[PDB]
């Protein structure tokens, strides 16, 4: 089980067995369960998760350098607000701005002053504290300050332990924020059960679950991202917890089921006809809505399938390739087969053999392999583009699928266009398939830019190794 008694979250590698290196056939990564270029840390994922909670202020206990990530996540936060029909504003992340003397004598007074400043300036309903590499090397003991100031102000003060070097993969930064929210914000033993509300563990993508579950007579509680401290608080009252990506939804949903009694759905992720059907059968079986689902399954099968016949014709024998993420990547590898696109290789940045829910019927890789066939050049690598070049020349695809930065520009210099899917709801469900077909068509038209770049560019790698 998840250990919530501690103010420190274990790492994802320690809790699951994260594998951040591998090359082979996806069937083998499924049966199994010197040079580096830089990765992501857990502090960045904490910035993007706990920094997008509305009504709360995240404190970065670090040197000012670790606070650089406010720019990208501020832009994502603003665009998510604009997408989700909310007023647009900048997120406020505050840094303790530690210096060399604070490395020598400790920086706990600066942390306390920064928390008090957050409370004074914004008066939030919650305050998160983000730890970094240097403040974990010196052991600053942030929990005492957190407890004292929480007792003083009244609002919860949540210490998040999200050092970069603690874990080899950055997915632990989701664990940290979810751990803190579970331990402090989510109210325990509530006296109100909102039987029409379901917790959708999602990101800053267009609202597609709202209309989709509205046909099932459900209200949507988007959490963590663009969520309110009260929405996070009323997460023990919802009738179910769901999400789109398994990787971002294991810890919080499993801990909710174990502790707060929120039912958790063990259903395939909603990508493709089979996956989305099986996903709706169970999100509507938990909420006892197994009568408005078949009437929505049939309606969408009678609406998207006629348009998918002509869409598979426009993409015949086209090669694809997914190079990003862990679980929002097996979903692409499975939707692309729904369009008939050839996918003989992929690159996922990590692979969790088990999930926090520990349920065998939640393997995304097994779903991708058993249904929709196998991938013969499956490869795991923690966002390293000296290895992406080898994979690209090994499979030689017409287009790739990316969501995270760092891999698309290399393929562009090789003349291989990429589909950027920052809006994670674009490829969700039946309209998701219909949108991904159009996206592939548009990208294949964009191939002229990457072919022009590939003919007038020099890769930094050396021909001794390029071979």
């Amino acid at each position: 089980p998840i250990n919530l008694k501690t103010s420190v979250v274990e790492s994802r590698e320690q809790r699951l067995g994260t594998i951040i290196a591998w090359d082979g056939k996806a069937s083998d990564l499924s049966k199994e369960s010197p040079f580096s270029q830089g990765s992501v840390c857990s502090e960045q994922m904490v910035e993007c998760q706990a920094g997008n909670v509305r009504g709360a202020v995240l404190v970065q206990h670090s040197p000012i350098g670790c606070g650089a990530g406010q720019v990208i996540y501020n832009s994502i936060f603003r665009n998510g607000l604009a997408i989700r029909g909310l007023p647009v504003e900048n997120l406020h992340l505050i840094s303790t701005n530690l210096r060399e003397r604070d490395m020598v004598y400790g920086g706990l007074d600066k942390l306390e002053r920064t928390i008090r400043d957050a409370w004074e300036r914004h008066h939030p309903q919650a305050i998160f504290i983000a730890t970094s590499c240097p403040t974990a090397i010196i052991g600053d003991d942030i929990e005492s300050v957190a407890s004292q100031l929480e007792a003083e102000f009244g609002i919860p003060v949540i210490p998040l332990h999200c050092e970069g070097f603690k874990s080899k993969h950055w997915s632990t930064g989701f664990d940290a924020t979810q751990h803190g929210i579970l331990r402090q914000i989510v109210r325990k033993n509530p006296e109100r059960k909102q039987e029409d509300l379901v917790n959708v563990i999602n990101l800053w993508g267009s609202d597609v679950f709202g209309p989709m579950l509205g046909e099932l007579g459900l209200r949507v509680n988007y959490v963590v991202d663009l969520a309110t401290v009260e929405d996070l608080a009323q997460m023990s009252e919802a009738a179910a917890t769901v999400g789109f990506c398994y990787t971002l939804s294991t810890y919080m949903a499993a801990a909710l089921e174990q502790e707060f009694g929120v039912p958790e759905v063990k259903a395939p992720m909603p990508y493709g006809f089979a996956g989305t059907d099986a996903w709706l059968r169970e999100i509507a079986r938990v909420t006892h809505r197994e009568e408005q689902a078949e009437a929505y399954i049939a309606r969408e099968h009678a609406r998207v399938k006629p348009q998918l016949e002509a869409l598979r014709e426009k993409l015949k024998g086209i090669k694809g390739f997914v190079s990003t993420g862990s679980a929002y990547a097996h979903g692409m590898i499975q939707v692309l087969r729904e369009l008939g696109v050839t996918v003989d290789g992929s690159l996922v940045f990590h692979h969790d053999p088990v999930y926090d829910s520990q349920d065998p019927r939640q393997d995304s890789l097994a779903h991708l392999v058993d249904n929709y066939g196998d991938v013969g050049h499956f490869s795991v690598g923690n966002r390293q583009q000296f290895q992406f070049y080898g994979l690209l020349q090994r499979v030689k695809p017409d287009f790739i699928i990316i969501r995270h930065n760092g891999l698309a520009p290399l393929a562009s210099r090789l003349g291989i266009p990429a589909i950027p899917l920052g809006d994670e709801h674009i490829a969700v469900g039946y309209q998701g398939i219909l949108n991904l077909g159009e996206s592939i068509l548009d990208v294949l038209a964009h191939r002229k830019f990457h072919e022009d770049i590939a003919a007038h560019v020099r890769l930094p790698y050396r021909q001794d190794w390029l071979a």
């Binding site: 990765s39 603003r78 303790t96």
Partner: protein, 445 residues
């Protein structure tokens, strides 16, 4: 107070982009797993949507210090990384940048990089921890490390004589000033116009590490920044004996550019006919694009904003404050320099704002916290007209609330896509005028 909302700069290890900005140079980082990605994705990709380039972005090797590299040290990881990088990557020069972990733990970096240098490998190591400062301090550290460990000793009878008409240009920070590529292109174009051989040392115009090996042969050093690059210049003066010219104000516009070029020429001793002929042609091109703008800006019915508030690093902060005062005649409102200069240069920086015009005297406050910046903008009544905010993506909401317009001119410029845009010199001044007044006019659109 210590706190900093909405950071205005990045880590000292983010000076890896100073090395990556040199052509055919690939920095190597000894740090935590996400220091390189964070610094790139925030100073380049969401600061004008600039790319990694040749040896930047996801090309930068990194040790990605795990828990093993902290408890037991990671000098052998850096040694192994350099050994593998010498065979994986093709770089003229490798720069080693240590994070806050090797600096706190006390890894003996010299004992690892030194053996490579003794073999003739072009590699360099710099100590840039997170606690040491921001990316400006790291920039100075990287420049000094490259100089000392790659340029090495100088012998005129072996390495070549000294050309009095060759200048090293120490100017705005690469990749942090959003328009640095075009700005360096403009600076080099003007310097080559007045008759100099330019070692721009950064960006596409640079010649790579061959230009850096020629640093001692340069006649002097130009520091085109209010405070950045003065440590490098002093180190070079001590080491090789090169005189330095400190031009604190970066010349946006024909008025400042003429004076800048005249002072550089009076330094070197260039021909006063080539300088006044290049300047004559540049003025001729520049002025004729102004009459038509005049017509617009001297006869606009709906009125133009009169007060501005520049919030940015000292270089652009002071170039923009000088331009928006001596050319556009705008009212200088709130000026805040947010790059955290050293305390010793603050007085002279401010004294530049005192003499910002014969008729106008202003002042700047050094503030790295954006909450206090926002509160001083709120606490400065900007007349009856709306004020124009010259800042970053953090001022969008405040400018919308103050009924005014915002022009993004520095880090982070999250709503500009920049390829070759420049705001310095003649062409850059024209582009800046277009951007400013397109933004102001686009208020009823």
């Amino acid at each position: 107070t210590n706190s900093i909302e909405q950071v205005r700069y990045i880590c000292s290890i983010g000076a890896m982009h100073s090395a990556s900005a040199i052509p055919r140079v690939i920095p190597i980082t000894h740090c935590g797993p996400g220091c390189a990605d964070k610094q790139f994705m925030n100073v380049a990709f969401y600061n004008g949507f600039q790319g990694g380039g040749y040896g930047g972005g996801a090309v930068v090797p990194s040790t990605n210090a795990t828990e093993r590299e902290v408890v037991f040290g990671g000098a052998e990881r850096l040694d192994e990384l350099i050994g593998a990088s010498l065979q994986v990557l093709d770089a003229d020069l490798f720069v080693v940048l240590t994070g806050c972990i090797p600096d706190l733990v006390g890894d003996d970096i010299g004992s690892v990089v030194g053996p490579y240098q003794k073999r003739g490998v072009p590699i360099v190591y710099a100590e840039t921890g997170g606690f040491r400062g921001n990316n400006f301090t790291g920039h100075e550290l990287v420049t000094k490390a490259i100089i000392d460990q790659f340029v090495g000793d100088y012998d005129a009878e072996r390495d070549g004589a000294r050309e009095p008409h060759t200048v090293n240009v120490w100017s705005l920070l690469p990749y942090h000033n959003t328009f640095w590529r075009g700005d360096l292109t403009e600076i080099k174009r003007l310097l080559e116009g007045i008759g100099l051989k330019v070692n721009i040392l950064f960006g596409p115009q640079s010649a790579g590490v061959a230009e850096w090996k020629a640093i001692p042969r340069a006649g002097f050093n130009l520091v085109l920044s209010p405070w950045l690059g003065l440590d490098t210049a002093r180190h070079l003066d001590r080491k090789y004996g090169q005189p330095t010219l400190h031009r604190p104000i970066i010349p946006i516009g024909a008025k400042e550019t003429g004076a800048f070029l005249r002072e550089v020429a009076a330094f070197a001793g260039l021909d006063s006919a080539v300088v006044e002929a290049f300047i004559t042609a540049e003025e001729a091109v520049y002025y004729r694009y102004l009459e038509d703008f005049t017509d617009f800006y001297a006869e606009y019915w709906w009125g133009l904003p009169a007060k501005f508030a520049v919030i940015g690093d000292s270089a652009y902060n002071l170039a923009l404050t000088k331009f928006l005062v001596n050319q556009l005649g705008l009212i200088p409102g709130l000026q805040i320099i947010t790059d955290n200069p050293p305390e010793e240069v603050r007085e002279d920086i401010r004294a530049h704002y005192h003499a910002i015009a014969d008729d106008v005297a202003t002042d700047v406050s050094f503030e790295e916290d954006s909450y206090t910046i926002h509160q001083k903008i709120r606490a400065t009544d900007f007349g009856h007209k709306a004020p124009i905010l010259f800042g970053t993506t953090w001022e969008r909401d405040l400018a919308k609330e103050l009924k005014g317009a915002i022009v993004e001119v520095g880090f982070p410029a999250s709503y500009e896509v920049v390829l070759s845009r420049s705001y310095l010199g003649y062409r850059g001044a024209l582009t800046l005028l277009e951007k400013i007044y397109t933004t102001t006019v686009s208020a009823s659109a």
